[PDB]
Design a protein around this ligand. Structure first.
Ligand SMILES: [Zn+2]
Ligand SMILES: [Zn+2]
Ligand SMILES: [Zn+2]
Ligand SMILES: [Zn+2]
Ligand SMILES: [Zn+2]
Ligand SMILES: [Zn+2]
Ligand SMILES: [Zn+2]
Length: 114
DNA sequence: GTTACTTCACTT
DNA sequence: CAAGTGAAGTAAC
């Protein structure tokens, strides 16, 4: 009912890119999925609220992993595993479900490497 | 066969 | 307890 309200409210394109299997195509990878998500929520304030994924500066974002794992279709645990293995660096302990982050070359208008 | 995850049942 | 570990798996390429 919640994921249903989340995905049902975001564009078919994003739902599909989120559903797409991760291969060697860089757009199919987790960083760019996070990035397209982040980029889009930037324009949908209401959804950005409900989900909890937004930039706090040109280089840091905060999120509610519990909700982000949902809209992305992955267990909480795999979300953490992906942040860990892709070199996202946590800048804050969980507080009311919010966590903060940064990753080199991952900004408002850039997603580097792979 | 490779790659880029994905998941689970613990542990910390 | 939120987040990490180690072993095992999945499927597009
Ligand atoms: Zn982007
Ligand atoms: Zn689902
Ligand atoms: Zn094979
Ligand atoms: Zn415990
Ligand atoms: Zn591991
Ligand atoms: Zn393995
Ligand atoms: Zn394996």
């Amino acid at each position: 009912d919640l994921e249903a309200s989340f995905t049902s409210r975001l564009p078919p394109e994003i739902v599909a890119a989120l559903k797409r299997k991760s291969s060697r195509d860089p757009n199919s990878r987790f960083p760019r999925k996070l990035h397209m998500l982040l980029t889009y929520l930037a324009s949908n304030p209401q959804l950005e609220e409900e989900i909890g994924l937004s930039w706090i500066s040109d280089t840091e974002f905060k999120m509610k992993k519990k909700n982000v794992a949902l809209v992305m279709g992955i267990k909480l645990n795999t979300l953490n595993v992906n942040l860990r293995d892709l070199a996202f660096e946590q800048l804050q302990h969980d507080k009311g479900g919010w966590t903060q982050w940064k990753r080199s070359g991952f900004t408002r208008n850039s997603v580097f490497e792979d």
